[model samples]
Target chain A: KILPHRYPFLLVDKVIYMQPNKTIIGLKQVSTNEPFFQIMPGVLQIEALAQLAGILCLLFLFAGVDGVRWKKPVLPGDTLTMQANLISFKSSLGIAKLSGVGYVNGKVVINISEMTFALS
Target chain B: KILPHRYPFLLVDKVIYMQPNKTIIGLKQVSTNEPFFQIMPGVLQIEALAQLAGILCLKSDNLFLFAGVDGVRWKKPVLPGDTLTMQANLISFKSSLGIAKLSGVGYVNGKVVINISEMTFALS
Candidate 1:
């Protein structure tokens, strides 16, 4: 289960793909009304991906340093699909390296360069 | 004028300091009962600061869209009664291309709790 993110904040709609601690993919549906500008806020898209990563890390410790790059514009009625891959995790060290990406309409919209999480 | 983000979604409280095209400082009061989260999702803090940057950059080109966040670290957890002072600086901008890099950070009582090392916004 994810943390205390409720409506307007819960970015992950559902877990579409999974392998427990190894990999995960989730999705979110965007409406035009949820935006800072006419276009969707890049942070929200990133957040969706973060939640996906968080789900994968909930079985462990999670402290994060997020890095990302926006590729294309995402708007209302668009579906955001997020994928998180665990790069490396040393259970004894309680640290995990992850990389995530968000896609809309088969196009990459957000690129998370890297994410470092503290695993428990 | 701020865009579509409203109650439950709008994290930015107000702009407290500014120096158009240079720097900006914003304030947001986090309460225990906003209902967004029991532990406050990290995205809200980043959005609050991003809105501050968006507003600061507003003086120059009005409205643009978000491009990306290259670096972000939450050094400490934000809690109720904790007041957030968000700051953003103009790193580099291509006036012609309408693209700018705004470095942002969120502080709680003079201590940096969140660091968005760099954020690239596409201004239009």
Candidate 2:
């Protein structure tokens, strides 16, 4: 099922693969014309990761989980590939560690981070 | 002695107090007309804190310390009366743990209005 988000607010373009209790990989195409970049120059990649974490929260943790961390900055005209894995999962409490690296011209610029999300 | 920095690049306006091995407090005046905010919205507050951290590193740690950050979203227009106070000190350093917290505020109507969380660079 799609995550039900529209333009501007929809951070992830598509979901590559997701296992119920294991991991999730999401994709977001970084475009120079995105509105967020107009005010915040290098926010697309962070927004993409935040969006991917949101998807994981809805699918695995629960609904309306609002805890996320941004460890690196993402620039324009860069392609970002994000992979998040489940570190710990309980009945209604879940924690996932996310790591993402952004690439441009086959070179890595941004490093991934370890984040925790709690659902109630 | 003041660290030689000109306008625009001069992130720290003035340093209030600093301890050689403990902590430091720096100040910056946030203005709407600052060159940085013209392109990046809500960046003055973060820049101010980064500037303060730079002063701490230069005096206490070492010169040319490049550890800095842009954390915590700042909300709304900073006026001429806006003042920021930043407190930075060593947390824990091992083979790991490069975490540093830079806390700041913007006063509009005599109230603190901004908070920041920045992680610095790890040494080699």
Candidate 3:
């Protein structure tokens, strides 16, 4: 529960693994209960990744995203397993960057080249 | 209204102009009435532009899903009472591949607040 998000907005369901400051694995259980189960927008895919990344740094501001590719839609029954690898973090500067990839049923669904966040 | 999106998720308020297959302009009126009005996430800013782009294509038959996006940057936070002015320019479209590419920029108070280098949509 590192994330300060709640229902409808908290996309990450749980964190399964972590190697503090280096990498982390998170899960988002997509269900029909979700409002976007009509179909998950690609932007939401990115948002899910961002939220997971947020857990690592723990009130960071989403600054930017680069080279995001959505390979497939995250259906209601799919369990989005996302992993974020910390690329760099300038703690003194309060800026960090991470790259993420999400999968559903072992199949790659989204790839984020880089996600930048600003630490408050 | 063309989009399949509904309340709480429907970000685009109304479209302002469009030249069909070339460029389109739209607006999203942010207000305290919004559920996310507590504090807008930057991701929502991107979604707002995507919804406006959907209207430009007039997505009809196949679902126009977001395929990819590159170089997304947010300059400022959007608050209630702000009218987000968005513009999307068609970069290209490949009917054979069911792909459409567009570049979008959003502004508030006549100042650039968000810019999307490329937004790709696939009809499926």
Candidate 4:
């Protein structure tokens, strides 16, 4: 399941799969026109991943991004696989690690890790 | 000193004051309904703060790009003429990865309206 978001800001393109209370995966096609350098780098890409996590939260917890990064450049025409895993959750406060990887013909143009979300 | 950023994108309005490798405080005005949401959220303000980092990046010339945005404080709706002031700290600098971190706090007069901690960037 997923939530609704506006455009120019909503980055999540399509939902690939989902595991309630656990994980969610999605995709976002990079367009060279994306401001932050004309190529989606760390900014929106990280936000995109957070939104994917947001879908997980829309059903569970957390509303905004807590922390995150980008391993490399995500150029235009690249399909980004945004993955979020609920490593642990217990209320009071919880953390989930998320990753955003860009693929072009099976090549990892960008890889992100150690990204986390603060949930309660 | 600020770098190249167009309207709506340019966050820091003026370099009120600055101190190299230390801290900086600047002003960013809110005009309302220019295009995007007039009362923007703290997260969107993060963009302004991040771009504000470009201001500090302009100082001394040797600066890095984007790394990761960290910290909390983005709470409160930013309205027009809120006396938006942006303050930044050059948290950490890594000569190798050309990495740099910037922490920003936007204030509405005396209240901490929006904040972005340790916005990592590439130092070149």
> What is candidate 4's lDDT per residue for A1-120, written digit by digit as tens?
435432136677797899887788878777765543345645556557666766765633223455555456666778787677665554555555554454555665444453455543
Ranking by TM-score: 3, 1, 4, 2
* Best-matching candidate per lDDT: 3
What TM-score goes with each of the models? Answer: 0.84, 0.47, 0.90, 0.75
Error of 3 at A33 (Å): 1.7
Q: How large is the interface RMSD of each prediction?
A: 4.1, 10.0, 3.4, 4.3
In model 3, the clashing pairs are: none
DockQ of 2: 0.06
- For TM-score, the strongest prediction is 3
Candidate 4, which segments miss by more than 4 Å at Cα? A1-8, A32-37, A59-67, A87-120, B1-8, B34-41
What TM-score does prediction 1 earn? 0.84
Question: Taking the tens digit of each residue's C-alpha lDDT, what string does model 3 give over A5-117?
Answer: 42248778888998889999989888888755356766777888887887876657888999988888777788999999999999688899999999989999999999998
| Candidate that scores best on DockQ | 3
What's the i-RMS for candidate 1 in angstroms? Answer: 4.1
Write the residue-wise lDDT of candidate 4 on B1-98 in tens digits.
Answer: 33643323566668788888787888878776443443554445777777777677667346455656656554555787777888888886665767
For candidate 3, give the docking quality class from DockQ.
Answer: medium
| Weakest ten-residue segment in model 2 chain B by summed lDDT | B62-71
Ranking by DockQ: 3, 1, 4, 2
